[PDB]
């Protein structure tokens, strides 16, 4: 374990340094905004998630040039049916880095954008020039105070601030949720709906994947924390859409913890029966988490997840280090043993001193989370 988790977050494969922007454009909640949509973006973006893009078509480059001077914000639709271009929800994206290159006589533009706000689609219009616009309504972030705020006795208000971690959590539950005896429910029930307890349980699951401490790497704000956790969870498009619909951070965290405990297997999306890997093999190779969005030479985005071992996969071609997302590793195309559908790539270290010597990178669009034994798919809260 000596690669460097900060290498992929920078997206070094894109080349020379880009012109960065730092001004944050954030619209009011429930406000109606008309924002353009990128055509070849089939990814479902999450707020706070980094998204790299390489555009080739002159229309895309022209739209980017027009946005660089304006608010630098575009929309990313959550295509439920990609064939008919149907989208009920989506996420805004703000360009934070850009660089134009006129290599080989064609206008190439490299852009790094970040998620910002969720939204509900009101109307979709397509202009005469091919590019499409969207009349959208900003979805509000429903922030809720502590469940005890409405029952808390005035005399015990001063005992709400707090200075063996297991012993500390027991004391925390007995003190913060003391007034729970005044309601129809006990303390342990409210503990399931407390942001801090949920964040700590998620932290315990995250430490299992990476040895980076939560003092700096993880944000303290439950809203930003929930969005960061969701952004690196390997789920199918339908479950991602459902999770995005959630307005409260508490429900988002509850759903995330439930998914992390339920879906222990990860099978092929096309096969549905071919098991590829388990959550035991998942580990974080990047600062964002185990899964992150990466762009390829042809502008296709892959929400790739890094795992230790993978099975039922055949390798196509020979290892290459060209446009590699993980510097110092060579990729080899990986296909499913049964359906022959592309699942990801096998990364092999170029040098012997590197550790781990080999790992797997699987694309989210080709995976399916599976619950063991026999049951259907459901996501609580």
């Amino acid at each position: 374990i000596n690669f460097d988790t900060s290498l992929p977050t920078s997206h070094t494969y894109l080349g020379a340094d880009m012109e960065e922007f730092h001004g944050r454009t954030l619209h009011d909640d429930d406000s109606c905004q008309v924002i353009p949509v990128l055509p070849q973006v089939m990814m479902i973006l999450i707020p706070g998630q980094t998204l790299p893009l390489q555009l080739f078509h002159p229309q895309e480059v022209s739209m980017v040039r027009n946005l660089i001077q304006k608010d630098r914000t575009f929309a990313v639709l959550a295509y439920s049916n990609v064939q008919e271009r149907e989208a009920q929800f989506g996420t805004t994206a703000e360009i934070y880095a850009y660089r134009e290159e006129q290599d080989f006589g064609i206008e190439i533009v490299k852009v790094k954008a970040i998620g910002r706000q969720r939204f509900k689609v009101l109307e979709l219009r397509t202009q005469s020039d091919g590019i499409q616009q969207a009349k959208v309504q900003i979805l509000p972030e429903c922030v809720l105070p502590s469940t005890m705020s409405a029952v808390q006795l005035e005399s015990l208000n001063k005992c709400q601030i707090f200075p063996c971690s297991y012993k500390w959590w027991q004391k925390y539950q007995k003190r913060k949720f003391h007034c729970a005896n005044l309601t129809s429910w006990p303390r342990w029930l409210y503990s399931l709906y407390d942001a801090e307890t949920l964040m700590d349980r998620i932290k315990k699951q995250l430490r299992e994947w990476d040895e980076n401490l939560k003092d700096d790497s993880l944000p303290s704000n439950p809203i930003d924390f929930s969005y960061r956790v969701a952004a690196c969870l390997p789920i199918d498009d339908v479950l991602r859409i459902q999770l995005l619909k959630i307005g409260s951070a508490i429900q988002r965290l509850r759903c995330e913890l439930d998914i992390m405990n339920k879906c222990t297997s990860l099978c092929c999306k096309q096969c549905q029966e071919t098991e590829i890997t388990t959550k035991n093999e998942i580990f974080s190779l990047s600062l964002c988490g185990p899964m992150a969005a990466y762009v390829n030479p042809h502008g296709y985005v892959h929400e790739t997840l890094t795992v230790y071992k993978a099975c039922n996969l055949n390798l196509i071609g020979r290892p290459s280090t060209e446009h590699s997302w993980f510097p110092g590793y060579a990729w080899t195309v990986a296909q499913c043993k049964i359906c022959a559908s592309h699942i990801g790539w096998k990364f092999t270290a170029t040098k012997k001193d590197m550790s781990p010597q080999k790992f797997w990178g699987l694309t989210r669009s080709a995976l399916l989370p599976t619950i063991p034994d026999t049951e259907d798919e459901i996501s609580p809260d």
Partner: peptide
């Protein structure tokens, strides 16, 4: 040979055009 036909989506190297045209249909599903 040298495999000049490549897949724009994943980067699969192929020695023939027929091999590539079938592989691109696998991504469509």
């Amino acid at each position: 040979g040298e495999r000049p036909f490549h897949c724009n989506q994943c980067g699969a190297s192929f020695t023939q055009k027929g091999n590539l045209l079938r592989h691109i249909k696998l991504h469509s599903g």
